[PDB]
Design a protein around this ligand. Structure first.
Ligand code: FMN
Ligand code: FMN
Ligand code: HBA
Ligand code: HBA
Lengths: 176, 176
């Protein structure tokens, strides 16, 4: 409405993830920045999803979602997920759906990690629904997390501005 | 309880922010990874805070908080915020509290950005409270956001493993 840099930009750069929803013929994927962990034990996550997203419809329908973690190498698939709508986009995507362990929603095999979630809350704040999901299963690529921490060579993906992305430095600073 | 890499590590690396709470004598700061935007218009944020944090007490008391954005250069102050407890830590911190525009909670002048929040919800999920706040005012450093986007030279801070941190590459990938 009022040109200027919107206030949400102050939290950026933010990690970019993929959200998978539905199953079989209805299987969808969208990009999502607005994701965070909300509890350590039980493991619970949340994602802000606008009502207008096909992903919002599929999450409400089935009560499950998958957070797949993409690398910088699949930015093209990530961009499609973030720009096109609903399950027909998968026919432009370089992605392989594999079953998941506890949700019906599929996982993305190229993903660094897939986090399988059962929805336990849905609150409305402003123009998005915050979908809170209990992590009931997870898979990942061993090298991307080899020392029980994230391996920075794996090219974890972040978002700076609308069409611009970056990964992390490989230079680590120790706090103690 | 069961040694192994905990499931929350799969979302990492995550941005690290500071949370400011209370005012005057009660002014506190803690580190917080688990922060995300939940709405664009109105601008609304959320932060997962364990009940055991002094910050949890101060947020419930006053209903306000500030998300300050730290750079890699102040990792030492950030580590103190994330390791010590309650307002006495400020006497080890290289930080200058300045007033805020709409909350009573102060801002951190060295911060790349301070995001002034009025609490509008508090839900409990697992071992944390998710504090949802309406952004009612904000300030930032112009060079850190010079092109209306984040300036990567500013050294935005991220968290890889318990005591390890990194910033972003300055190398930008265009998605279109
Ligand atoms: C990097 C990036 C991050 C995004 N993050 C979110 C998000 O956090 N929440 C949201 O509702 N939409 C987000 N979007 C928008 C959706 O990904 C995009 O609108 C998508 O076309 C919706 O697809 P769908 O209708 O198939 O679900 C994002 C887009 C991009 C490119
Ligand atoms: C990098 C980092 C991130 C942190 N993130 C969070 C968080 O998201 N939520 C939380 O409750 N505690 C978090 N903590 C823990 C608090 O910052 C830490 O326990 C602090 O000592 C609590 O201080 P207080 O008791 O003065 O509030 C984090 C600590 C570090 C070092
Ligand atoms: O760019 C990130 C983004 C977040 C939420 C949206 O609704 C759309 C885009
Ligand atoms: O390391 C990040 C962190 C998040 C939540 C906590 O409660 C403690 C630490």
């Amino acid at each position: 409405y009022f040109q200027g840099m919107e206030g949400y930009r102050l939290l950026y750069p933010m990690r970019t993830y993929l959200i998978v929803s539905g199953h079989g013929e209805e299987t969808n994927v969208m990009a999502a920045d607005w994701v965070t962990v909300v509890s350590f034990d039980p493991f619970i996550v949340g994602v802000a999803v606008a009502p207008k997203r096909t992903t919002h419809k599929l999450i409400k329908k089935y009560g499950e979602f998958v957070i797949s973690v993409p690398s910088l190498d699949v930015l093209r698939d990530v961009w499609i997920a973030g720009t096109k709508k609903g399950p027909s986009k998968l026919k432009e995507m370089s992605v392989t759906l594999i079953p998941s362990k506890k949700v019906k929603v599929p996982s993305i095999e190229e993903a660094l990690a897939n986090i399988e979630c059962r929805v336990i809350d849905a609150r409305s704040y402003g123009d998005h629904t915050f979908f809170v999901g209990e992590v009931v299963g997870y898979t990942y690529k061993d090298y991307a997390f080899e020392k029980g921490k994230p391996n920075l060579k794996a090219k974890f993906l972040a978002h700076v501005s609308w069409s611009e992305f970056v990964t992390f430095s490989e230079k680590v600073h120790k706090a103690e």
